């Protein structure tokens, strides 16, 4: 039953961050872990993520969006940060637990 898929893909188009050309991960709010993760991004993946963002801001100041064609597609969204971030949060839980011992 492709329900969860059906839903996720729906919510994805609902959000609309793809209309700006941002990957689901370019929208994460930068708390402490996210900040660390980003420092671990390989030069190129970081420079691309930057442009995507600097481009979305420029869109927002102009009050426009990308022509439908260039919109990110639910299945082509690269979760470029997701795995780094999970490790950062895993390294952190270890420390946290180890200091209570």
């Amino acid at each position: 039953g492709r329900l969860m898929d059906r839903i996720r893909k729906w919510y994805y188009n609902a959000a609309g961050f793809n209309k700006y050309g941002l990957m689901r991960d370019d929208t994460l709010y930068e708390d402490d872990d996210v900040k660390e993760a980003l420092k671990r991004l390989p030069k190129d993946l970081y420079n691309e993520r930057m442009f995507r963002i600097k481009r979305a801001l420029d869109l927002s100041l102009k009050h426009r969006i990308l022509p439908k064609e260039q919109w990110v597609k639910y299945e082509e969204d690269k979760p470029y940060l997701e795995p780094y971030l999970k490790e950062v949060i895993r390294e952190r839980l270890e420390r946290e637990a180890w200091n209570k011992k």
Binding site: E48, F51, K54, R55, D58, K62
Partner: protein
């Protein structure tokens, strides 16, 4: 209950005209400056 009445409305008139004229002038000036950013074009040319 309010002797000003008449003068209060004569003012309201002057206020609309100046307000009209002024909001316009400043709307232009605001757009004028901002144009620099409105028309702006950027491209990502990573080295290869």
């Amino acid at each position: 209950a309010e002797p000003e009445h008449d003068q209060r409305k004569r003012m309201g008139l002057k206020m609309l005209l100046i307000s009209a004229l002024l909001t316009s002038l400043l709307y232009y000036m605001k757009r004028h400056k901002w144009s620099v950013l409105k028309s702006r074009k950027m491209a990502y040319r990573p080295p290869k």
